Every structure is written in structure tokens, then in C-alpha cells.
């Protein structure tokens, strides 16, 4: 039911050939989208029959550079706009048409009736109608501060006007079913949302987007959190305090706040806190901890020095690992952040006077065993056939994913194979390996055993054909169980067919 979103924006997919597949994996069977629902750079043919289940988007809905005419987001009731496109808009619809004409024609957001924070930006798309027919301030929440709306009607077609059955001639479509239902501006008592004109028809104070009845069970969407079908303001805390002394005792009614729903325990690859929350980055003056059975938590901390990757501390704005900053990972056995290798890395920049990065400097990462964020590689030294410097890397969490989708990204590399012999799991997100001319031993890795949730998979294309690998004799050594291996020889096997010999198999 609940699924991660994305964070690409106007940035253009490197593998258009698999781009749609990623979205299907992300949004198939998904009712609530944690983070942003980004739909970008789709063709006319494209079937989006997976988006039909989507109901909430805690992020910001972006529909940009799409030659499709239909985007079925009928069931979408609420956009919380926790994050905003350009920090100002909760819904952005940009450049959908131009070089049967192509482009978005109807928005058909017939169930959207709530935008808690953030405005609406619609511009640059000719086929679109029913963009100025909608009363946006009824969908905008009462306390919503960001109530900005910049819309562009500039078109190249005629708009068949709303059904006469659409009160106020306010509609998403010509159809009788696409009439905009109001649930704020037409209420009395002043109560934010209602299902009728009288105050006795007001929705409970803890509902959002409307309701079917007075009580808090009846809400179309909960404004704050969902307490097993009820909408509470906070979830029940895990701690109760002795009336007299204030001795913290755990109460059995306690629930962690994941997204906008109270949960007994967090989902996988998510951190439980003493503050009664599920999160991906731990609060300040806090350290990450592992449990008896691997369960990662978050204890308060004197707090130990630790290795920050990209998207953390000073490496928040840093684009990728470079010669100027490669030295920091010295001895790091775990980087708290993302590792992103770019052409500019090994090429260097003379305008900053950051020299090139030599292939021996990558030796540093021999120590490194876990990455909280993600590993992205669109560059490498052609010197190296494989990823040996990351032979030690046991797990990529992907708590921060690249473009919000991909844990592991390998594109445009002159390398023979991988060799991540230690890589036993990928915590969250999808694997994007493409346009790697020489890459073999790809179908040899059992990626079905590196993934943890079904929204995950590997997306490969423009590699070296396995037909060629087998033909040039590049396959798994006979001492690698079920021929699962990361590269050539017994120095790569996953499970050894017979007993160890340290590095090598025998």
C-alpha cells in the first residue's frame, strides 16, 4: 500500500528504455506516496495503469515534459506538500506538448480536494483544458500559507465546456463525473471541511479533504496521523511517566509515526527513535545503533566522530567525490552519506584547480563496508576492469537514493565486470546498470537475493550481450554454487561449492 517517491525534478533520465519500468515498480499497487510523485519524460504510447491506486502524495506532484494525453490520478485525494517544487508549489504541470497532436488534455484530478501546504504552477502545455475552470482555493487548506497560484491558459485547441451538471461550471473534464466537488469554501460554522451546508455537516477537526460523517473514523484523509482507522493529532507515545518521580516506563499503547500513519513498529531499512518516530536521517546529538537481530534504532549520545558522505554536513552541496576531497574516507568502514563518481571526478576541474583523481586514490575505500545513502558511477578509470575498491562493501542502505529511485547506478563505464563479492544486500531503491559496453557477469549475480521490498529490481540495457560473454568463455568458475559469481575465477563466488581458502576458493 505505502511506497517511496522520487527526487529527479526536470533532470532527464539516462535510460529512457527502462524509465517507465522504474515508475511501474515504484507506483504499482501503491496507495500512499512517501516523498514526491514525479512523472516526467513519458511517451504517447505509454500505459500508466499503475498510478490509478495512488491516493496521497506527502511530497509535490510534478507532471513535466510528457507527450502522454492521459495521467490517471483519479483516486488522489490529498497532496501534503511537505517538500515543494521550487519551494513554492505543491502541484507543478510544465511543458506537456510541442515538438493526432501530443500533450496532456485533461488533469482529471476529480478526487483531489486537499493541498495542506504549497501552491499550484501550471504552464506551457497546449492540449490541456479545465485548468482555469477549477476553484483552487477550495482544494487549498485553510491554514495553508503557501496559497500562491501561477497558471497559463495559452493553448492551441478549443475547450468543449464543462457539463451543465457541473455546479459553477467548475470541472476537470467535459464528462458528468469530472465536476469539481467543493468541501471548504461552501461550508458553515467555518469548519475547514464539510459534506453539507450546515455546521452539523462539518467534518471532524482531524479530517482533511472532506469526510462521509461527523466522527473521526469518517475522514477522507487524516490531517495529522492515522491511529488504526481513527485520526489522532499525535500518535500514542511509547513512554508513560510515574506520577511522582517521572521514571520513564514503556506503555503498550505506544506507536511510532511513519509518514502520516501510527505503526506498532517501523518498516524495514527505517530507524526507530526514542522520540517515537520512524526516519532515514537520525536527529542531532544522536548515533545510529544495531540490535540483536540487526534492527537499526537511534540512541541519544559525548558523541563519536563518524565519516560523512555526499548530502551530509559540508558534503551537502559537494557534487561528487573529487581529488580535493577524496582523502576524507581514509579508514572509513562506513560512510554516512552518498558516494557519486562523475566524469568531472577523474577529469578534474582547472577552473577550481582541483587536479584529476588517480586510480590508486580509490584504494582508500578498501576499508569501507556500508553506505547509508547510495553508490552512483557514471565514470571510472578504464585502467580498472571492475569494482575491487568496493569488494569490502557489504551493504548499500539507499536511505538517500539517487534521483530518489536508484540505490546502485552504473552507466557509461569501460569495465569488464563488478566484483562486489561482499555486497549481500541493497536496503531500498532500484539498481540502474546500463550503457556499459564491456560488462559481463551481470546475469551471474543473484540480485533477487540483494533486494528486500518488491518495489525494487535491476534495470539493464546497452551492456555487453551475455551471448558474447559465454562465447568468449566469461562465466562463473565451477567452485561457485549455482554459478552465482561477481566475475571470473574462484576469487568471486557467492557461496563456495567446497571449503574456504581465505580470499580464494578450493
Amino acid at each position: 500500500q505505502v511506497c517511496t517517491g522520487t527526487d529527479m525534478k526536470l533532470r532527464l533520465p539516462a535510460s529512457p528504455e527502462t524509465h517507465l519500468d522504474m515508475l511501474r515498480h515504484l507506483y504499482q499497487g501503491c496507495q500512499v506516496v512517501q516523498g514526491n510523485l514525479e512523472l516526467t519524460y513519458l511517451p504517447t504510447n505509454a500505459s500508466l495503469s499503475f498510478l490509478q491506486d495512488i491516493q496521497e502524495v506527502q511530497g509535490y506532484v510534478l507532471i513535466a515534459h510528457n507527450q502522454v494525453r492521459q495521467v490517471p490520478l483519479q483516486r488522489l485525494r490529498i497532496v501534503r506538500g511537505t517538500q515543494l517544487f521550487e519551494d513554492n508549489y505543491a502541484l507543478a504541470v510544465l511543458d506537456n506538448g510541442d515538438p493526432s497532436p501530443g500533450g496532456l488534455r485533461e488533469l482529471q484530478l476529480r478526487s483531489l480536494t486537499e493541498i495542506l501546504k504549497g501552491g499550484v504552477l501550471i504552464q506551457r502545455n497546449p492540449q490541456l483544458c479545465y485548468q482555469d475552470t477549477i476553484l483552487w482555493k477550495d482544494i487549498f487548506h485553510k491554514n495553508n500559507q503557501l496559497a500562491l497560484t501561477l497558471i497559463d491558459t495559452n493553448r492551441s485547441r478549443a475547450c468543449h465546456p464543462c457539463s451543465p451538471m457541473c455546479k459553477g461550471s467548475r470541472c476537470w473534464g467535459e464528462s458528468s463525473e469530472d465536476c469539481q466537488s467543493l468541501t471548504r469554501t461552501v461550508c458553515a460554522g467555518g469548519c475547514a471541511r464539510c459534506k453539507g451546508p450546515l455546521p452539523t455537516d462539518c467534518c471532524h477537526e482531524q479530517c482533511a479533504a472532506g469526510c462521509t460523517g461527523p466522527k473521526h473514523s469518517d475522514c477522507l484523509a487524516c490531517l495529522h496521523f492515522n491511529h488504526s482507522g481513527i485520526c489522532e493529532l499525535h500518535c500514542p507515545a511509547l513512554v508513560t511517566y510515574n506520577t511522582d518521580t517521572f521514571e520513564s516506563m514503556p506503555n503498550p499503547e505506544g506507536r511510532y509515526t511513519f509518514g502520516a500513519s501510527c505503526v506498532t513498529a517501523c518498516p524495514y531499512n527505517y530507524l526507530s527513535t526514542d522520540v517515537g518516530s520512524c526516519t532515514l536521517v537520525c536527529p542531532l546529538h544522536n548515533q545510529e545503533v544495531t540490535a540483536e537481530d540487526g534492527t537499526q534504532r537511534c540512541e541519544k549520545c559525548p558523541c563519536a566522530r563518524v565519516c560523512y558522505g555526499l548530502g551530509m554536513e559540508h558534503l551537502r552541496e559537494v557534487r561528487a567525490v573529487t581529488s580535493a576531497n577524496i582523502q576524507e574516507f581514509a579508514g572509513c568502514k562506513k560512510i554516512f552519506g552518498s558516494l557519486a563518481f562523475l566524469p568531472e571526478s577523474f577529469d578534474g576541474d582547472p577552473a577550481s584547480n582541483t587536479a584529476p583523481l588517480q586510480p590508486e586514490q580509490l584504494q582508500v575505500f578498501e576499508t569501507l563496508e556500508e553506505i547509508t545513502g547510495y553508490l552512483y558511477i557514471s565514470a571510472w578509470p578504464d585502467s580498472l576492469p571492475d569494482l575491487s575498491v568496493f569488494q569490502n562493501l557489504q551493504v548499500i542502505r539507499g536511505r538517500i537514493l539517487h534521483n530518489g529511485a536508484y540505490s546502485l547506478t552504473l552507466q557509461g563505464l569501460g569495465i569488464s565486470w563488478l566484483g562486489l563479492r561482499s555486497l549481500r544486500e541493497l536496503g531500498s531503491g532500484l539498481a540502474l546498470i546500463h550503457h556499459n559496453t564491456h560488462l559481463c557477469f551481470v546475469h551471474t549475480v543473484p540480485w533477487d537475493q540483494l533486494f528486500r521490498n518488491p518495489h525494487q529490481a535491476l534495470l539493464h540495457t546497452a551492456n555487453r550481450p551475455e551471448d558474447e560473454c559465454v562465447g568468449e568463455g566469461l562465466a562463473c568458475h565451477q567452485l561457485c554454487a549455482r554459478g552465482h559469481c561477481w566475475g571470473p575465477g574462484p576469487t568471486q563466488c557467492v557461496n563456495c561449492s567446497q571449503f574456504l581458502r581465505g580470499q580464494e576458493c578450493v
Epitope: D138, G168, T185, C187, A188, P197
Partner: nanobody, 121 residues
Framework: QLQESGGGSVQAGETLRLSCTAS????????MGWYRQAPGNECELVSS???????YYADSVKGRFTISQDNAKNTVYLQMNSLKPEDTGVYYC?????????????????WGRGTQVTVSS
């Protein structure tokens, strides 16, 4: 649940009685009021009565329209005498207390409230 009754086609100069019926409530300490919206013209407050029976009207209706809140049957009446075609439109009753946001006429139009008035000559 408030409903409007008493509309119809009539020749001008005739009379109509309008009923603002309820399904629960008490209008006590909550002065009621009739509104009306003519085709492609602004929503107007035609008449309103206090909790104590101190009536108000607009300049076009006074001496022709008399408003009155029955306590027993718990229904608000609006007697419209000396009807003119300039009157024609849809008349919505609604507590001046429980006032909407998108506009009284506009909101009650959404929920399908009020009753239709038609006047020829």
C-alpha cells in the same frame, strides 16, 4: 436540514409565500435571513428577522415582502406581495450566524438549496 419551498411561475403583481423549513434546530438567539440571486446578477440579502422579531428589508422589497419566524412549527416564512419581474431569481434562506465563504447564494447553489421564482407581464 434546512429546505426552501414556495417557488413557481406567476404573472407579475401576484403573490407568493416562501417557507424555510428545518429538520432539527431552533432559530432562537440566531437571527435568520432570506437571500436571492437573479440570473448573472450579484447575491442580495432581501430580508432578515432577529431572535426577538425585529425585521429588516432592502429598499426594493419593503412594503411588499413581510418576513416572519414561526416558533411552534419551527419554520421561517417570507410573504412576497406586489411581485415585479425584477424580483425573479432563486431565493435561499440561511442563518446570518452560520455564514459561508464562497458566498451565501453560491455555496447553497452548490448543495442544491433555495427555491425558484418566475415573473412575467
Amino acid at each position: 436540514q434546512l429546505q426552501e419551498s414556495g417557488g413557481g411561475s406567476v404573472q407579475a403583481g401576484e403573490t407568493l409565500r416562501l417557507s424555510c423549513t428545518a429538520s432539527g434546530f431552533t432559530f432562537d438567539d440566531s437571527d435568520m435571513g432570506w437571500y436571492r440571486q437573479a440570473p448573472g446578477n450579484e447575491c442580495e440579502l432581501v430580508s432578515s428577522i432577529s431572535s426577538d422579531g425585529s425585521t429588516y428589508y432592502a429598499d426594493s422589497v419593503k412594503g411588499r415582502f413581510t418576513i416572519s419566524q414561526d416558533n411552534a412549527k419551527n419554520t421561517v416564512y417570507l410573504q412576497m406581495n406586489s411581485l415585479k419581474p425584477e424580483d425573479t431569481g432563486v431565493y435561499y434562506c440561511a442563518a446570518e450566524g452560520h455564514r459561508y465563504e464562497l458566498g451565501t447564494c453560491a455555496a447553497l447553489d452548490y448543495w442544491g438549496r433555495g427555491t425558484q421564482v418566475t415573473v412575467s407581464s
